[PDB]
Design a protein around this ligand. Structure first.
Ligand SMILES: Nc1nc2c(ncn2[C@@H]2O[C@H](COP(=O)(O)OP(=O)(O)O)[C@@H](O)[C@H]2O)c(=O)[nH]1
Ligand SMILES: [Ca+2]
Ligand SMILES: [Mg+2]
Lengths: 423, 67
């Protein structure tokens, strides 16, 4: 039943806010928290993401966290900013300076308890909490360092609940500082141990989509976040609307994660937008499996699919959907591991997203995701072999050994993905 | 992990305090050593000058005990 949502740091709170805008519109919830929709399907699983307050008000089960106020002042002024519970805004003043150690060990530690108080108050009133979703980046300090601290503390207090992240992976193409690969390697180490499912949202891929496909010569954070929000709407459709398949976080984990560490998913979306032509079922299906539609910059032809979830939204022929899903599997059979039979599952939901008649969302557990980790690993090493920029971290009490261990664990994750690809 | 978290933040506190301490003691050692050196420079100058006043007395006596 209930999911608790947490958004941390600049990136986490920006994508987080858009997520709540997009799903509040799909469920007919306006910025005051009033329902003004046309269909009982909108309210039937509303409690998964929204609490009900007095006056038939729907309030997101959402906690907003940062070490600086700036992005959270912007959240509060944003279009849906009034819908959040005021007590669920938990902010420090210090900032974290793009420094994972500040987020995880010094500044974040000072604030983490007050975040947990709010987590506990939301959790306490859940009829049957399924677990948590966190939105954050891995390249900064607060979402990366403080976010992974939160995950660890949440696990200690709710060890039998599911932990899910939407984790934005850094790229030099859309880069704020040189230390991003350090912060991401340190964070991946945490995610490998302490999440059950992680959607790898790669800024490399979002940028390439905006540039190559959508023809945006200069992509902003807003253009990248349009892709992120459509993806997030798509991958949570099964949690939010009535349906058979992957209807809660645990069942999704059980279908998607054959070995506990290999829980890093490559999302995709079709059609790609920033337009009037009807998209056919064959076209959605080909495009949702296309490298160019993937939100992690990994070539899926360089690996194999362990498991896949496909979600189609809109009024369309279920027969045609089944036939096309079967067609892609039959013609591309070598890219689906033979030792997990029937490893592709398909859901269809009648309610389309805003501004589209038809859409498809793709969630892949592919061994090609190793490309993402290798790219981060190479950027990490190029610096770390000269100990460049380390004083930012050792000044917060960290040793070099902790960097060596994180790098080694992420190289092990890469070797494991490679083992199942060769099996 | 909680115990590692506590050691990182104590290590940071310990290094910052140690930096402050060592900078405080270095400064105090420099300012002392400088004071003593300057005073020894001035005391040697005065001492050469007192030796001149002493020698000027031996001159007025040589002249008195000449006559
Ligand atoms: N996709 C996306 N990435 C972002 C956004 N804001 C920052 N980033 C990325 O997030 C990383 C920086 O972390 P940020 O979240 O600003 O730092 P934090 O506040 O300390 O967590 C870099 O990799 C940026 O490219 C955003 O709104 N959308
Ligand atoms: Ca403080
Ligand atoms: Mg930032």
């Amino acid at each position: 039943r209930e999911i608790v949502h947490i958004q941390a740091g600049q990136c986490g709170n920006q994508i987080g806010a858009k997520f709540w805008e997009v799903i509040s519109d799909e469920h007919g919830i306006d910025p005051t928290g009033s329902y003004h929709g046309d269909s009982d399907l909108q309210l039937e699983r509303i409690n998964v993401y929204y609490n009900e307050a007095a006056g038939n008000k729907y309030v997101p089960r959402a906690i907003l966290v940062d070490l600086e106020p700036g992005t959270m002042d912007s959240v509060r002024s944003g279009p849906f900013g009034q819908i959040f519970r005021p007590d669920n805004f938990v902010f420090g003043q210090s900032g974290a300076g793009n420094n994972w150690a500040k987020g995880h060990y010094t500044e974040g530690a000072e604030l983490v308890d007050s975040v947990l108080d709010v987590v506990r108050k939301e959790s306490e009133s859940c009829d049957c909490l399924q677990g948590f979703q966190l939105t954050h980046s891995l390249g900064g300090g607060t979402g990366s360092g403080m976010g992974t601290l939160l995950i660890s503390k949440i696990r200690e207090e709710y060890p039998d609940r599911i932990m899910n992240t939407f984790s934005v992976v850094p790229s030099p193409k859309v880069s704020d500082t040189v230390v991003e690969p350090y912060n991401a390697t340190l964070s991946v180490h945490q995610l490998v141990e302490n999440t059950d499912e992680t959607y790898c949202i790669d800024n490399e891929a979002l940028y390439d989509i905006c540039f190559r496909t959508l023809k945006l010569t200069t992509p902003t954070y807003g253009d990248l976040n349009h892709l992120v929000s459509a993806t997030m709407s798509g991958v949570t459709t099964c949690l939010r609307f009535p349906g058979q398949l992957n209807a809660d976080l645990r069942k999704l984990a059980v279908n998607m994660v054959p070995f506990p560490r290999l829980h890093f998913f490559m999302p995709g979306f079709a059609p790609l937008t920033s337009q009037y032509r009807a998209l056919t079922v064959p076209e959605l299906t080909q495009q949702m499996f296309d490298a160019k539609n993937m939100m992690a910059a990994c070539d899926p032809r360089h690996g194999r699919y362990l498991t896949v979830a496909a979600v189609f939204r809109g009024r369309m022929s279920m027969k045609e959907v089944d036939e096309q899903m079967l067609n892609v599997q039959n013609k591309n059979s070598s890219y689906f591991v033979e030792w997990i039979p029937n490893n592709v599952k398909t859901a269809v939901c009648d309610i389309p997203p805003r501004g589209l008649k038809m859409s498809a969302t793709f969630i892949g557990n592919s061994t090609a995701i190793q490309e993402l980790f290798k790219r981060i690993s190479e950027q990490f090493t190029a610096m770390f072999r000269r100990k460049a920029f380390l004083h930012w971290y050792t000044g917060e009490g960290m040793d070099e050994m902790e960097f060596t261990e994180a790098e080694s664990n992420m190289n092990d994750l890469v070797s494991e993905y490679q083992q199942y690809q060769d099996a | 992990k909680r115990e590692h978290e506590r050691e990182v933040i104590q290590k940071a506190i310990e290094e910052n305090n140690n930096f402050i301490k060592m900078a405080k003691e270095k400064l105090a050692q420099k300012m002392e050593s400088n004071k003593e050196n300057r005073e020894a420079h001035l005391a040697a100058m005065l001492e050469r000058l007192q030796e001149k006043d002493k020698h000027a007395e031996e001159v007025r006596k040589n002249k008195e005990l000449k006559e």
